[PDB]
Design a binder for this molecule. Structure first.
Ligand code: SF4
Ligand SMILES: [Mg+2]
Length: 258
C-alpha cells in the first residue's frame, strides 16, 4: 500500500515536497501522525475563475498575486500558489517569494536549498501550464471531479459578479486551458527569493535561483518515487544531524538511532 493510498492523499502540495527536501522521513511522519458546505467541484471552479481573472490582469496591469498552479508531475498531481508574478522593467516575467523571519538572522543554507526547490517547482509547474502540458483530463483523472454535477450557486455568484457566464464545469475547464496556452503567457524568467525581518523590515538576503530543468526533474522523480511507494523514505544526512534536535518525531525515529 503506497503512502498516497495509506495517507488517503489524491494530490500533493508544493510545500509537501519542500518539507520533503528538509527531511523526507520527517515529512512522512507528518502525514502519518498529524499534529463541507462547498464541494470539490465548487472549490476547483473558484480556482479556475481566479485564473481566468488573473491572466488578463497580469497581461494588462503587469502584476498579480496568489496565482494557483497545478499539474501532473511524475504520476502525481502537484498543486501550489505563487506569491507574486510581475513583468520587470525589461519585460521579463519574474516570480517573487517573500520569506519573513521574526529574528534578524541570515537564513540557513538548508533553508535556502528548501526554498530554492519550492520556487523551482513553481516555475516547473507554471511553465508546463502555459505551454499546454496540463490538460483538463489529467486533473479529472487525479481529482475525481464529476463534470456533469452542476456548479453550486456560490460559484455562479462569484462568476457573474465579474460578468462571465459559466456553462458547466467542463466548459469552465476548457476555457482555462485555452486562456493559459493561447494568451501569450511566457515562461517565468527570474526566480527571486527575498528574506525580510518582520519588525524592522530589514533585507536579510536575496537569492536568485539558477533554474536547471534537468536537475529539477531528477530531484522530483526521486521524491515522487517515495510517494508512489517505490522506495523507502530517507532521513537527513549525517552532516545535517542537527535537524533532529528540534524534530517532532526524533523520539521514535529509528533513522536517528541507526
Ligand atoms: S529525527 Fe531527523 S531523520 Fe528522523 S524524521 Fe526527524 S529530522 Fe528526519
Ligand atoms: Mg509564498
Amino acid at each position: 500500500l503506497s503512502p498516497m493510498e495509506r495517507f488517503h492523499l489524491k494530490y500533493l502540495y508544493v510545500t509537501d515536497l519542500a518539507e520533503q527536501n528538509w527531511c523526507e522521513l520527517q515529512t512522512a511522519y507528518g502525514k502519518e501522525l498529524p499534529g463541507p458546505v462547498t464541494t470539490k467541484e465548487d472549490a476547483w471552479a473558484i480556482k479556475f475563475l481566479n485564473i481566468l481573472l488573473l491572466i488578463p490582469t497580469l497581461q494588462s496591469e503587469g502584476h498579480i498575486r496568489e496565482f494557483p498552479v497545478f499539474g501532473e508531475v511524475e504520476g502525481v498531481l502537484l498543486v501550489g500558489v505563487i506569491d507574486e508574478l510581475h513583468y520587470t522593467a525589461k519585460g521579463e516575467l519574474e516570480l517573487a517569494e517573500l520569506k519573513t523571519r521574526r529574528r534578524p538572522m541570515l537564513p540557513l543554507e538548508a533553508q535556502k536549498k528548501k526554498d530554492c526547490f519550492q520556487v523551482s517547482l513553481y516555475k516547473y509547474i507554471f511553465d508546463a501550464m502555459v505551454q499546454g502540458k496540463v490538460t483538463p483530463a489529467s486533473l479529472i483523472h487525479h481529482t475525481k471531479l464529476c463534470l456533469e454535477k452542476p456548479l453550486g450557486p456560490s460559484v455562479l455568484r462569484h462568476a457573474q459578479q465579474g460578468g462571465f457566464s459559466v456553462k458547466s464545469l467542463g466548459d469552465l475547464m476548457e476555457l482555462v486551458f485555452l486562456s493559459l496556452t493561447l494568451s501569450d503567457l511566457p515562461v517565468i524568467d527570474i526566480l527571486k527569493i527575498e528574506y525580510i525581518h518582520q519588525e524592522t523590515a530589514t533585507v536579510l538576503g536575496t537569492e536568485i535561483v539558477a533554474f536547471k530543468e534537468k536537475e529539477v526533474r531528477a530531484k522530483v522523480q526521486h521524491y515522487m518515487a517515495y510517494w508512489m511507494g517505490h522506495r523507502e523514505p530517507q532521513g537527513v544526512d549525517v552532516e545535517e544531524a542537527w535537524k533532529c534536535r528540534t524534530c517532532t518525531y526524533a523520539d521514535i525515529c529509528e533513522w536517528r538511532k541507526g
